[PDB]
Write a protein that binds this DNA or RNA. Structure first.
Ligand SMILES: [K+]
Ligand SMILES: [K+]
Ligand SMILES: [K+]
Ligand SMILES: [K+]
Ligand SMILES: [K+]
Ligand SMILES: [K+]
Lengths: 263, 264
RNA sequence: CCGGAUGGUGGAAUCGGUAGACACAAGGGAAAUCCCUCGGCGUGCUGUGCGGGUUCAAGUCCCGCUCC
């Protein structure tokens, strides 16, 4: 018998060279497979809903695999976790049909960017938040961002190493708010082009610091040029908070956080 | 030569340090902090913290002071020192204070926050900054079973052996337990605390929360004046020295105590 | 006149904080993905035209020299 299982993985990529399995470096996927394999007692290969670059964290990542071995729930949750490193962890298990597929079944991914806005660098979670010196204007930022909403040509916020096809994406919602000293950027789209978020954030920050007009983000978008927008934003601050899947699969959706961040 | 009494608001992540207490043998927050301060003042510097934390415990409201004959502009102590500090340690603010100031002795009351990730499966993000407690906690029940420690009591049951205070008596300003999504936070403020006082109150408070003991237990323990009766000391990675109290005359800056996104 | 002269190329570095972010190449190993290297030395040092200086700290300031 083949069993298609879906796991909700969570992690802290600060100590990993990303998710993708590199035969020469540390990858969340690798550590995750080693464990799953020990439980199923057979070589296991997983498929994630969205690979994160080296540095980016995850709290809503979703993966699936097929094992011939039958393990009770705890085996996949409490079990795998017992084999996983402290930074990586399983949030929930759920057997799914054959028509499910972490990546291809995903209707839209969602990210959150954590910006610690203070003159002096942070200490706690120094690898989990991006530190931005210049005073940000959450208000102004949010406004200068609604122009990216909908379907547009994110070429200006694209990448040259983008292995995807058409640079067109559909943004469900992009909001920027401030939590005390923090500034958070929540963005949801059907998908994103290489470094799309870290780029939108980069240019959004310049605006926030009043180094550019609100109209700049819009001018960039239509500029269809990358060498016009700000430089890619730091990684340590990006969190893959949540992925969208058809309600028919009935996958559990726990708080996306990160941490104390309201859902 | 002029002597300058300076007060720094230090913040850090003790996950990688054997505590604050400078030890000529291991990594201590205080040591790394002094090395830096010294490079700035270009003279051996010795600091005094408002409350030493044990190996593991973090800090976001810690306050220290020192005296240097060297005159450095503000940035030198803030942006400067930080530039010499490790990434986990950091200065939050500088402030020259009078001679009658003293981080420890001037402190009117310290304050802590305990972060409990209440979920069957262990956390990944901040795995060293939050305490993972398997059994389902009852924030409500916990808070209630705690108000009995409020005020001045004999915290012998929540004390320790390696304790140096000549008296295990303390005055609790307030102890509250709330739940943030999967988290359970315990905020406690007192004039001072006896060795492992907080981690102990939390330990026994958790047993109650998990319904392994009655709300009346915390109270029975307190009056029991016995330690071998209460729960075992709670984990360290979850304790944060969020804030210290000082006379308003000193006018020290009081930024958000957090940790992180935690409302002030 | 004043503002610049930093990597192979752009292009950064909080009204002195401890280089080269970021982007785009190149080269090598495991059409493209990916690791590491890509100032000079080598057997970590000195290096932000060039020596000298001040400062705990200099690309970041004071002085003499070359060119926009
Ligand atoms: K630094
Ligand atoms: K430098
Ligand atoms: K530098
Ligand atoms: K010098
Ligand atoms: K120079
Ligand atoms: K000069």
């Amino acid at each position: 018998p083949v069993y298609k299982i879906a796991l909700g993985i969570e992690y802290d990529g600060s100590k990993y060279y990303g998710w993708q399995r590199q035969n020469e470096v540390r990858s969340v996927q690798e550590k995750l497979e080693k464990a799953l394999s020990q439980v199923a007692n057979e070589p296991i290969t997983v498929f994630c809903a969205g690979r994160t670059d080296a540095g980016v964290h995850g709290t809503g990542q979703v993966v699936h695999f097929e094992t011939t071995a039958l393990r009770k729930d705890a085996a996949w949750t409490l079990g795998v976790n017992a084999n996983l490193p402290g930074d990586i962890a399983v949030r929930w298990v759920k057997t799914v049909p054959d028509d499910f597929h972490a990546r291809f079944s995903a209707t839209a991914r969602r990210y959150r960017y954590i910006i610690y806005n203070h003159r002096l660098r942070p200490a706690v979670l120094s690898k989990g938040v991006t530190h931005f010196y210049e005073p940000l204007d959450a208000e102004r930022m949010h406004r200068a961002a609604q122009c990216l909403l909908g379907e547009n040509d994110f070429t200006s916020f694209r990448a040259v190493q983008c292995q995807s096809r058409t640079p067109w994406r559909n943004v469900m919602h992009i909001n920027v708010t401030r939590h005390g000293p923090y500034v958070v950027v929540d963005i949801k789209a059907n998908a994103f082009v290489h470094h799309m978020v870290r780029n939108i954030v980069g240019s959004l920050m310049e605006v926030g610091a009043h180094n550019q007009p609100e109209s700049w983000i819009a001018e960039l978008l239509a500029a269809k040029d990358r060498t016009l927008a700000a430089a890619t934003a730091k990684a340590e601050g990006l969190y893959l908070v949540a992925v969208d899947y058809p309600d028919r699969y009935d996958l559990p959706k726990p708080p996306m956080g990160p941490l104390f961040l309201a859902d």
